[PDB]
Structure formats: C-alpha cells, structure tokens
Design a protein around this ligand. Structure first.
Ligand code: RAL
Ligand code: RAL
Lengths: 237, 226
C-alpha cells in the first residue's frame, strides 16, 4: 500500500519503475520534415513505456481509470521533457533526444518555431547541472509531475481521489527530504533545496505549454494522445 | 542590503509593499477587465521595486522579470481576493463574477474554472497573508530567471524559502508539516504558471490591439534614476 511505504521504499519503487532509454534508427541521416518525423516516432514509442512507468508509481493505480487518463493527458509532454532534460544533463549545449539523436541549437533551427523551446530545454539542463541534480531526486520530481499537473482540473469519489493524490505527494516530499538528509545537508539546506527543485517544475510546465502550442501549429492530424488511446494502454485486461 | 534582513523583517517588508485593490471603471466584459489590468500594472511595478533585492538587478533584468511574471502576478492576486468568495472571482470589489458570466466570453470559462479551483485550494489550505506575499514574490523572481544576476536572484529566493519556513515554525507546525506545506504551496505555483500560459493564449486569440506590456512601457513605469 502506497501510503505505508517508508522513504527508502518509495525511492526504490521509483528507481525500479524507470523506463528504458530508447533509440532512433540507424542507417549508415541527417535530416531536413525528417527531423520532426524522427522525433514523432520516438515520442510515440516512449508513450507506451510512460504508461508502464505511471502504473508503477506508488498510488497511481489506486485511482480510477478516468483519473489516471486525466493525469496523463495533462502531464505527458512535461514527462517527456523532464526525461529529455535529465538525459541531456551531462552534455552541455546539446539535447539528447536519443543516444543517436543528440542535437544542438542550430539543428533545432531546422524546425520552424523550435529554437525558442530548444533554448528553454537547454537552460533547464544547465540548471540541473548547476544544482548537481541526483537520479533519486529526478525520479521524485517526475512522479510529482504525474500526480500534480492534472489534479487542479478534475463528486464524493473525486474528493477521495484528490485526498489520496495529496497524501502521496506528501510522501514524495518526505522522500525528497529523507534523501537530502541522508546526503548530509543541514535542515536549512534541505528546505532551500526542496524549494529549488520544486520551482523547476514551474519552468517544466511553461515549456510543456509552449511545446504543445508549437506541436499544434504544425497542423498534423495527431498531436495529443486521445482519451481512448490512453484508456487502452491504461485499461489493461 | 537585502540579504541581511531577518525573516521577520522580510515579512514586514513584503506586507508593507502590497498594492491597492482597484475598482473597475464603470465585448464590454473584456473591455472592463482590460482597463483594470492596465491600471493594476503600475501598482505591480511599485510593488516589485519594494521586494527585497529586486532593485539590485539591472533595469534590463528587472524588465525581463516583469515581462515574464505580470499575468501570473495578476492571477495570484485575483485568486487571493477571491478566497472568501466561493464560486466567484473578485476581479474588483464592484466586479464579482461567477462562472456563468465567464461563459459570456468565448474561451474564458475553462480558465475561469481553473482560477476558481485555485481559490478553492487556497481556502482549504487556510493560506495566510504572510504566505501569500512570499508566494507572489517568488513568482516575480522565479518566472524569468531562465551569472551574478542569477546568483543574486537565487540567494533572494533562498531567503524567501527561509522566511516561509520561519512563519510555519512560529505557527507551531512540526518539521514534517513545515516541509509538506512548503511543497504544497510551491506546487500551486506550477498551476499558476499553467493558467498564465493558457490565459495568454486566450488573450492572443482575441486579436485585440495589444496583449503584453512592452519593454519601453515597463521601463518607463520603473522610473529610472536620472
Ligand atoms: O519533438 C518532440 C515531439 C514530437 C512529437 C510529439 O508528439 C507526436 C504526437 N504523438 C501522437 C500520439 C500520442 C503521442 C504524441 C511529441 C514531442 C519532442 C519535444 C519538443 C521539443 C521542443 C518543441 O518545441 C516541441 C516538442 S521534447 C521531446 C522529448 C522526447 O523524449 C521525445 C520527443 C520530444
Ligand atoms: O481578463 C483579464 C485580462 C484582460 C486583459 C489583459 O491584458 C490587457 C493588455 N494589457 C496591455 C498593456 C499591458 C497590460 C496588459 C490581462 C488580463 C484578467 C484575467 C484572465 C482570466 C481568464 C482568462 O482566460 C484571461 C485573463 S485574470 C485577471 C486579474 C486581474 O487582476 C485583472 C484582469 C485579469
């Protein structure tokens, strides 16, 4: 039961749940149309692993299927983006979409309207580096995004669901504090770092919104995962 | 100067810096809201200049922070004055609107509902004025912060965190409760960013004369020394 986990058990559950790092193809490239096709193909494959990951975040499968879908509809691009930033952290000036799709700013220019968001993503990677963000902190933040982003936009059942999400979010706060304490930070340093980490989430939200507007401007048939697509992925037998 | 303030001195400074509540002057609905927002802007700049550490930034950087934060700041203010009015948004004391009135503006109701939900969250948490004033200052300093200038902003942000924790400690919260409440408050800021992004998209969709305050307007309001 999610609310019974110790901080150590929460960390271990989240690290265990992590999705794999996917590749692009692989063909002894480059890309004109082509770059967006590769990125779309990658994102579409990552979404499947994201659903698997979400179902392993403690407390998530306790929610109704409807609410699970809503949280993912709200969070999916933020989650792709924070994953991208983490993968890119050790690669100054580059975004590691995949190990074989490692792009710089000038390659971002090849997609109309992409550079400004590319720059925001690079700045977030820089911030992660400057904070020396740890993998255990990263998995906490990604779980927070999943549970928090859609909770403000959802009856008696809904009240029960929100209470549960808030309790699990509190457990994740406890877990972040535990990690910082185990690492030797003073109480003051712990609360300052907790705040610094959580403020990053506002920037991640900003980038997701700006990215979604950009995706929509491309006039493709499909931009967002539909309710029933998420449903089927989540609505397992 | 600013980084030597105690937590108590920080709180007093922020409370003292609070802008006034303006009245609406009286398609019409949006005309009224646009006029109100335009008038609130100067008062926001006056407030910003009183947030400890803000005026130590270059004017260029002060303007950038305002360009990034202005709508989030209007929104958090709206949410705060609407706390004690469940189901309604108190844009002005003479402009209290419910969601049915938000429906009269094409594309507004979705954001209206988000704002109401935020006000509802504030109510449930029993958000205090001293905490509100800290959160608003964090929006100002954090929203545009994407070397010496960034370091200064981060030191000020750390002082506001310390201040928030101090307020909680004095109120008798356990260490666990302090950390949990700090997190709860900061996560609401992600929702305020979201509402500002959606609101900006909405305002742009209206195809009015103008949406964002210009660099020159903000700089003029900041009233440079001479
Ligand atoms: O390029 C993409 C991207 C491309 C297509 C996407 O969606 C394709 C539509 N697809 C439909 C079915 C459901 C899943 C989405 C999503 C992201 C990525 C990003 C992006 C960056 C800047 C910007 O302006 C817009 C997006 S960030 C990102 C991280 C990834 O791991 C993968 C792709 C990406
Ligand atoms: O309606 C407005 C609003 C109207 C016009 C605005 O900008 C007018 C352009 N003006 C140009 C010169 C610089 C200042 C802005 C900003 C907010 C307000 C809001 C809003 C809500 C929902 C939504 O979908 C969009 C906006 S929130 C708000 C809070 C206020 O204190 C005042 C107006 C408002």
């Amino acid at each position: 039961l999610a609310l019974s986990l110790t901080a150590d058990q929460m960390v271990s559950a989240l690290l265990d749940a992590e999705p794999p790092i996917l590749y692009s193809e692989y063909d002894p490239r480059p890309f004109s149309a082509s770059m967006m096709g590769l990125l779309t193909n990658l994102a579409d494959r990552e979404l499947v692993h994201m659903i698997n990951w979400a179902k392993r975040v403690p407390g998530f499968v306790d929610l109704t299927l409807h609410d699970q879908v809503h949280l993912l509809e709200c969070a999916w691009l933020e989650i792709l983006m924070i994953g991208l930033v983490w993968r890119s952290m050790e690669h100054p000036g580059k975004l590691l979409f995949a190990p074989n799709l490692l792009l710089d700013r000038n390659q971002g220019k090849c997609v109309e309207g992409m550079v400004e968001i590319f720059d925001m993503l690079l700045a977030t990677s820089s911030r992660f580096r400057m904070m020396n963000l740890q993998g255990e902190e990263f998995v906490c933040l990604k779980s927070i995004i999943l549970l928090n982003s859609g909770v403000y936009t959802f009856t008696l059942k809904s009240l029960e669901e929100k209470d549960h999400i808030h309790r699990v979010l509190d457990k994740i706060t406890d877990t972040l504090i535990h990690l910082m304490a185990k690492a030797g930070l003073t109480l003051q340093q712990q609360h300052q770092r907790l705040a610094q980490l959580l403020l990053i989430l506002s920037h991640i939200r900003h980038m997701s919104n700006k990215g979604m507007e950009h995706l929509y401007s491309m006039k493709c048939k499909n931009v967002v995962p539909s309710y029933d697509l998420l449903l089927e992925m989540l609505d397992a037998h």
